[PDB]
């Protein structure tokens, strides 16, 4: 129930339907450990989306500004995109090579440790900036 609610809210906020279930479960567990009332904020956010009928996260962010639910939404987006929740240097990393902040350049820029296609791929010309690859 709570895990499905968190996954649905994450899919709405990040704007991408394909989200790893294990990464989402780990993120939810970490969020509940960090904040003991996280699920209440999740339900309040989803209630806001359902009541106001927000088409995408652009409208939800444009409205609802200055509400106390903005920080948790931004935290969810940052956790899904970067893979961490805390700003410290020992913060646990929950997603690398699958974090959503690497995907928009996955087709050109190499996710460092993991190799691109072959030992001389960079001889080829890169794709245009104005096209979004996938997801």
């Amino acid at each position: 129930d709570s895990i499905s609610d968190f996954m649905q809210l994450s899919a709405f906020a990040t704007g991408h339907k394909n989200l790893d279930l294990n990464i989402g479960s780990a993120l939810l567990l970490a969020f509940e450990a960090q904040k003991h009332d996280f699920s209440t904020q999740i339900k309040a956010l989803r209630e806001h989306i359902t009541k106001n009928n927000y088409q995408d996260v652009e409208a939800l962010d444009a409205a609802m500004k200055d509400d106390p639910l903005h920080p948790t939404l931004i935290q969810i987006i940052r956790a899904w995109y970067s893979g961490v929740i805390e700003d410290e240097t020992n913060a646990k990393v929950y997603a690398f090579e699958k974090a959503l902040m690497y995907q928009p350049s996955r087709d050109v820029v190499v996710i460092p440790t993991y190799a691109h296609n072959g030992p001389n791929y960079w001889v080829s010309e890169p794709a245009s900036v104005d096209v979004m690859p996938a997801f």
Binding site: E97, A115, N117
Partner: peptide, 17 residues
């Protein structure tokens, strides 16, 4: 091993790995 053969084991796109 996941650096060359990708994490899903499908290797590189160009087939080198």
């Amino acid at each position: 091993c996941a650096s060359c053969h990708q994490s899903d084991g499908k290797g590189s796109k160009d087939g080198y790995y």
